[PDB]
Amino acid sequence: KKIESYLDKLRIKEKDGEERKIYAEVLDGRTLKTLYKLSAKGYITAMGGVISTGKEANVFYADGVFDGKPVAMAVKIYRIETSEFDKMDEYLYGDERFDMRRISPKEKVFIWTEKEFRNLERAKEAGVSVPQPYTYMKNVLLMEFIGEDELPAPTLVELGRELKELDVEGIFNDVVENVKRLYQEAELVHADLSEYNIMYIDKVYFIDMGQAVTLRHPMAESYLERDVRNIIRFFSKYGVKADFEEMLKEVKGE
Ligand SMILES: N#C/C(=C\c1ccncc1)C(=O)NCc1ccccc1
Numbered sequence: 001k002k003i004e005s006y007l008d009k010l011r012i013k014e015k016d017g018e019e020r021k022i023y024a025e026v027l028d029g030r031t032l033k034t035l036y037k038l039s040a041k042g043y044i045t046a047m048g049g050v051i052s053t054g055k056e057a058n059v060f061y062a063d064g065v066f067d068g069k070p071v072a073m074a075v076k077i078y079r080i081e082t083s084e085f086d087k088m089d090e091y092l093y094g095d096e097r098f099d100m101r102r103i104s105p106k107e108k109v110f111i112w113t114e115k116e117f118r119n120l121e122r123a124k125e126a127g128v129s130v131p132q133p134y135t136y137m138k139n140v141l142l143m144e145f146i147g148e149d150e151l152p153a154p155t156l157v158e159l160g161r162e163l164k165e166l167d168v169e170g171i172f173n174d175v176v177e178n179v180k181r182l183y184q185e186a187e188l189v190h191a192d193l194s195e196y197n198i199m200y201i202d203k204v205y206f207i208d209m210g211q212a213v214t215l216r217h218p219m220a221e222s223y224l225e226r227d228v229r230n231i232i233r234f235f236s237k238y239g240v241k242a243d244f245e246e247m248l249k250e251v252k253g254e
Contacts (some may be wrong), residue, residue, distance in 0.1 A: 005029070009036050011046040013063075022050055026058050028080055034138045035075075043135055043142055047075070051152050055079075056088065056112075057210075061150050064142060066134045072145035074131060074152075076116070078109045080139050088112045091191060094216030109139050116210030117141050119188060126185030128178050129205050146205050153205065156195035156234065163238050166200070172235045172242065174204045179227065180251045188212050189220045193227040195234045224251070 007024055010032070027035070038044045048061030057078045064073040082105075089108065092098055097118060098111055113136050120133035120143060131144035147153040156163070156171075163171060175198060182188050190197075191211045199205040213220050228248050235242065 006032060006036070011039065011044075013046045013048055019049065023047070026077070030080055031077060031139060034140050038135075038137060038140065038142070044073075044075070045070070048150055056086075061145060061152075062142075064134070066142075071134070072147075072150070073134060073142050074145045076113075076141040076143065078113050078139040078141075080109055082106075082109050087191075088210070091115075091211065091213050091217070093213070093218060095214050096216070097214075112210060113139050113141050116208075117143075119186075119209035119212050122186045123182060123188060123206070123209055126181050126188075128181045128186055129174075129203060130209055131205065131207060146199050146201065146207060148201075153199035153201045156198045156200060156204075159200060161238070163200075168235065168238045169240055171200065171204060172231070172240045175231055175235075176247055176250060178204060178206060179224075179231075180253075182206070183224065183251050184253060187215045189215065189217070189224045190227055191219075191223045192230075194230045224248075 005024065007020065007027065010023070012019060012023060035044065035047070043064050043066065045063040045065060048063070051059040051061055051074060057076055060075045060077070062073045062075045064071055092100065092111070092115070095115070098115065100108070100111070103111055117133050117136040120130055123130045124132060131146050134142040134144065136142065145152070179193070182190070189212065190206065191213055193206070197206065197208045197211075199207050213223060225248065228244060228251065232242050232244060232247070
């Protein structure tokens with residue numbers, strides 16, 4: 001009559017039936033040990049509810065500790081099961097921080113995770129508005145929780161019409177400025193920047209930096225142009241009048 005898993009070694013607050021069920025479903029044996037280890041080392045204080053679900057990754061809330069202070073965290077967990085070809089691998093093209101000549105393809109997800117963490121660091125250093133990275137281990141990344149009282153900040157697409165009551169032109173400009181810093185200082189380009197991965201509290205936040213490439217990537221320039229078109233498409237719907245070439249110039253500084 002053996003226990004099924006070691007799930008109960010995790011501190012999960014409001015651990016009733018359904019919360020545990022969710023955790024049991026998404027956590028494999030390896031990830032569980034990792035979460036346990038991050039807890040034992042002091043980073044994770046208690047795990048909370050699901051924040052987002054996805055193909056490549058799931059994100060949960062946690063209370064935690066970083067640099068001697070309590071923090072609210074997003075705990076991003078990359079799914080460990082990986083296919084022989086993922087676009088995440090292609091996103092590594094030309095990134096000198098990583099050479100897959102020293103990794104086993106069964107552990108590439110750890111590289112995706114590290115890359116996202118290092119992108120967050122690089123972005124934050126360049127003054128781009130992104131969650132502060134805290135630490136990472138295996139397929140787990142811990143970063144600043146964007147929002148308040150365990151409610152994640154609304155994405156642009158969630159705000160929708162509401163953007164008109166918060167100076168929508170100012171918000172567009174805030175978006176552009178961040179793309180500019182990301183391009184000129186971080187030398188990064190988001191592969192698919194849109195209303196779906198930009199959050200807003202009292203300023204914009206770019207919240208998924210794993211889907212990014214360095215300027216050495218063959219598609220870096222196309223991704224950038226498409227990003228600009230994405231932004232223009234979206235913000236025009238709310239009355240913002242902007243020109244493609246102007247903002248592309250503004251980001252790149254010709
Ligand atoms: N990254 C990211 C997320 C989605 C995502 C995209 C692409 N792949 C996997 C997950 C996300 O919802 N994060 C929630 C969050 C992050 C940071 C602070 C507060 C709340």
